[PDB]
Design a protein around this nucleic acid. Structure first.
Ligand SMILES: [Zn+2]
Lengths: 138, 222, 150, 208
RNA sequence: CCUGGUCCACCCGUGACGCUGAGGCGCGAAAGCGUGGGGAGCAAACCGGAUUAGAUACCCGGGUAGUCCACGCCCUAAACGAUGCGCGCUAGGUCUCUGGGUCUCCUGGGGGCCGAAGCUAACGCGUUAAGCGCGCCGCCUGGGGAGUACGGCCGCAAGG
RNA sequence: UAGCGCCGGCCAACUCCGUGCCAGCAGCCGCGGUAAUACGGAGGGCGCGAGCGUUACCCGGAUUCACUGGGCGUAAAGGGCGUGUAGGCGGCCUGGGGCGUCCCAUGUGAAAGACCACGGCUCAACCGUGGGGGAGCGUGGGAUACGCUCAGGCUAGACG
């Protein structure tokens, strides 16, 4: 059974870029949407729209890449270099505000989920809150 | 120059041995054969030919390479027309990575041409004569067109990219631009300037190259 | 200009009938202490000859290293199949902290302060190689903005 | 056993001139003059490539041997230099140059460093008015390091200051020869030191 | 004749009822144990024949248990894909068993070989993953000593 | 007053002689059978200095018990297979509660220690004085994404 939604999402995204897809479908949800709101907002991905996939509601996430390389194997610098659920089910990891992690000397980001909204590290720290640390993307 | 809608010649070649990455350049399958979408080949030609004008008038050098049996008698022709170098007979591994080691082979031709004009011919052992006569023989095959290469070429014009993926490999590593007349079986993801089209067909190779060269010349003003 | 820096030389062996014909191996690091480091691995029948070759290889493929005031713009773990290397930027004064190999390579990258850590198989060669890919992955806060464009 | 033994043997091992004797380490003979090869039967021998530790080692030594301090104190300094905010290296040097004995050297009241220590342990050195015999005393900024009233009439000190008419004093220090006094203005900066050392190599050394 | 699993199509019905799974219970090749039946062929042990320096073997002729049947016990194994179960995700080519389709082609499930990305110490793996991932169980933590010793549990015993 | 360890690799420090798989060294790899930078003395050298070595023991190197931060095709490692117990874990939308969870305020978190700063004893060790920090828990106030729970609704999982 699908055990972890978000991980499946993140993982659909990774698994795509690696093979360089223009876009990737993914079952939709009032949260997976909120996370995706950030990926676009930050710039890891072009964007996303609600799409009817065989009667079922999906999210077309529009992947983004870098330019065509020189010399041999011109597979473009990936925009989303790294991405992984930090907090997993059966191991949910919550963090205090003073405890929000800096990512890649601050270059990547961290998506949490606060009682105030799905946030970035920067925004979280600005708001003075913390919570379910969702994933590391950089 | 530009081409017509010459569709009575290119519209696919290979059976079902294709490379999934080529999909972007196919129309559909007919009688078990892939058919290249020409409306698209026009979009690619209009760029590749741009590159060549750029090169040409900039006074550049394009190595023509095609070891295919069918393109043999064509490659020779076309290159000869610009002032372009070309690889006809067989492509020597390293004619670009190990150029300085091969260019040496070139000088060996240079030095032998000399002896077979000078007085020191019949005068000296004849065993060596034959021995030396054969060396030119072979050189006047492989190097026939490479000779024109004073230094590594600004671009390569390859015909069957998948057959010459050695040449392509090399070039790719030395950052020399790649131009190839490609199709169904190639990895477009590695050819700087593609030209999707049939190629076993003399009628195809011939057109693709002639229109290129005419571009080449009109570029320099002749 | 460029300063040679030998990492290690080993004597490798073969086997023919009657003898064990030997071969030598050299690992050299090159760089200009500004921020472009090379790295060769030359094998040759004689040692002076090996290094003389390794030297060749290195100078051919360097790595432009970003340098933010002596340190590295951001940590990077880098698996090289078997070896793993950890680069983590430090503040002026702590000075380079690695081993025989990564040190050498960073030193010529002109790095000046930094915290390393080797992990897994510690094989001079691989660790070395890793340390490169490692440096090749470094990116400036500039280089990222420029990549996440629209 | 705060060392004390053959001196220009070290001027020799390091390959760098070590001003350990003041006069004489200026006359054709700090030994480095005409005999740069290190001590021992093996001085004149070809020297194999110095392993990473090796270089870090000698570079630490060059520093230590310069001020002539027992490793025990050297270490301690470095330790306390790491607890301070600032550059773990330049701050080291700071304290090092903050030593009573050393100051007397820079102030010129002594031919050399060695001679400076004695000047202190025999009490010819005033500090803000009270004498001081402990060299490990750290001079704070704005201190009046002087000479013992009693010791002013000295055949030594006297011949030294006479030399100070002509030499400039460390940029971070002042001195009134006419009154055999002198102050400590501020902690000198690395860009203000002349040492032939490479701090980074010394720091690196302590992380093994 | 009695009976389990399974696949496809239609998308009809329930409405998340799901995945895993300590201990437990059941199944569990071959040999082997009890009682009874049966016994053609084969064949431990055993009886002879030849081979050899010798032959307690490899070869030849016999041959009892056993091997077949019932009920009961035993429960191990290179019990191997030497690869736990379940879900999603990531180029293809080809051969094959099988179901639906508008059937020179599409579409589902299964078995093979080649192979993208990727992984891998390498061999290799590669939509039948040894790839990217989530859940849950099982197990490993230098070789020999030892799968021994002790203890307990099991079994008629052999033993496990 | 000056001593003690060390000078094959790790590991900074190399020669002569004695010796001859002996005598002996030795943390590990090893050294020694007449050419020993590895035994024994010597010169010389390195390191440290009223100390230097040694043995013992703790943490470290060891991400070699792996939360951080490991693994199981062949390196040690998937349970012989299934069944399902307890447990762990679980799909989409809406609302309530707000237990986990996050923010705030507050009491507590003695002193000494550690830390920063200033000072005391000619320095320092030692000591004083002042400042700052904190996890955990108590109470009060707040938030509601996500987990939990209750409610209602769905059909993409499952089942018919
Ligand atoms: Zn001197």
């Amino acid at each position: 059974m699908l055990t972890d939604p978000i991980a499946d999402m993140l993982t659909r995204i990774r698994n795509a870029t690696r093979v360089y897809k223009e876009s990737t479908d993914v079952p939709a949800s009032r949260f997976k949407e909120e996370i995706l709101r950030i990926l676009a907002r930050e710039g890891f991905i072009k964007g996303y729209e609600r799409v009817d996939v065989d009667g079922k509601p999906y999210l077309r996430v529009y992947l983004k890449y870098g330019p065509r390389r020189q010399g041999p194997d011109p597979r473009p610098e990936q925009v989303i270099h790294h991405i992984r659920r930090i907090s997993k089910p059966g191991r949910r990891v919550y963090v205090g505000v003073k405890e929000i992690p800096r990512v890649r000397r601050g270059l990547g980001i961290a998506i949490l989920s606060t009682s105030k909204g799905v946030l970035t590290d920067r925004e979280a720290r600005k708001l003075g809150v913390g919570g379910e640390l969702i994933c590391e993307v950089w | 120059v530009k081409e017509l809608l010459e569709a009575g010649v290119h519209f696919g070649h290979e059976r079902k041995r294709w490379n999934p990455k080529f999909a972007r350049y196919i129309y559909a399958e007919r009688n078990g054969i892939h058919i290249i979408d020409l409306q698209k080949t026009m979009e690619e030609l209009e760029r590749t030919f741009r590159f060549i004008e750029d090169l040409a008038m900039r006074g550049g050098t394009i190595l023509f390479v095609g070891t295919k049996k069918q393109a043999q008698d064509i490659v020779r022709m076309e290159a000869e027309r610009a002032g372009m170098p070309y690889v006809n007979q067989r492509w020597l591994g390293g004619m670009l990575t190990n150029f300085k080691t091969i260019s040496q082979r070139v000088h060996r031709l240079e030095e032998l041409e000399a002896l077979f004009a000078s007085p020191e011919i019949e005068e000296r052992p004849k065993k060596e004569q034959v021995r030396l006569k054969h060396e030119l023989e072979r050189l006047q095959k492989y190097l026939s067109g490479f000779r024109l290469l004073k230094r590594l070429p600004d671009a390569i014009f390859v015909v069957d990219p998948t057959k010459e993926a050695i040449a392509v490999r090399e070039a790719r590593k030395l950052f020399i631009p790649v131009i190839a007349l490609a199709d169904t079986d190639s990895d477009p993801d590695l050819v700087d300037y593609i030209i999707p089209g049939n190629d076993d067909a003399i009628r195809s190779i011939q057109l693709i190259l002639s229109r290129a060269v005419d571009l080449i010349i009109q570029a320099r003003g002749g | 200009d460029f300063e040679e820096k030998m990492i290690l030389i080993r004597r490798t062996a073969r086997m023919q009938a009657g003898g064990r014909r030997f071969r030598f191996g050299a690992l050299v690091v090159v760089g200009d202490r500004q921020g472009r480091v090379g790295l060769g691995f030359g094998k040759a029948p004689e040692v002076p000859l090996a290094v003389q070759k390794a030297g060749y290889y290195a100078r051919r493929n360097m790595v432009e290293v970003p340098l933010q005031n002596g340190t590295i713009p951001h940590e990077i773990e880098v698996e090289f199949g078997a070896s793993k290397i950890v680069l983590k930027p430090a503040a002026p004064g702590t000075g380079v902290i690695a081993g025989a190999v990564p040190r050498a390579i960073l030193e010529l990258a002109g790095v000046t302060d930094i915290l390393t850590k080797e992990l897994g198989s510690r094989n001079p060669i691989n660790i070395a190689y890793a340390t490169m890919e490692a440096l090749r992955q470094l990116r400036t806060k500039a280089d990222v903005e420029r990549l996440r464009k629209g | 056993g705060r060392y004390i033994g053959p001196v220009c043997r070290l001027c020799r091992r390091e390959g760098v001139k070590l001003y350990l004797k003041g006069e004489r380490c200026y006359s054709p003979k700090c030994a480095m003059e005409r005999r740069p090869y290190p001590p021992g039967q093996h001085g004149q021998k070809r020297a194999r490539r110095p392993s990473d530790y090796a270089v870090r080692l000698r570079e630490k030594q060059k520093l230590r041997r310069i001020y002539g301090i027992s490793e025990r104190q050297f270490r301690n300094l470095f330790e306390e230099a790491s607890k301070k905010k600032g550059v773990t290296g330049s701050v080291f040097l700071g304290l090092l140059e903050s030593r009573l004995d050393n100051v007397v050297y820079r102030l010129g009241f002594a031919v050399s460093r060695r001679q400076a220590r004695q000047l202190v342990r025999h009490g010819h050195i005033t500090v803000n008015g009270r004498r001081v015999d402990l060299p490990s005393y750290r001079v704070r900024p704005g201190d009046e390091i002087a000479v013992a009233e009693k010791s002013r009439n000295l055949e030594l000190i006297r011949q030294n200051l006479e030399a100070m008419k002509g030499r400039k004093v460390g940029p971070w220090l002042s001195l009134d020869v006419e009154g055999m006094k002198g102050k400590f203005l501020r902690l000198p900066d690395r860009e203000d030191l002349a040492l032939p050392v490479n701090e980074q190599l010394v720091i690196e050394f302590y992380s093994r």
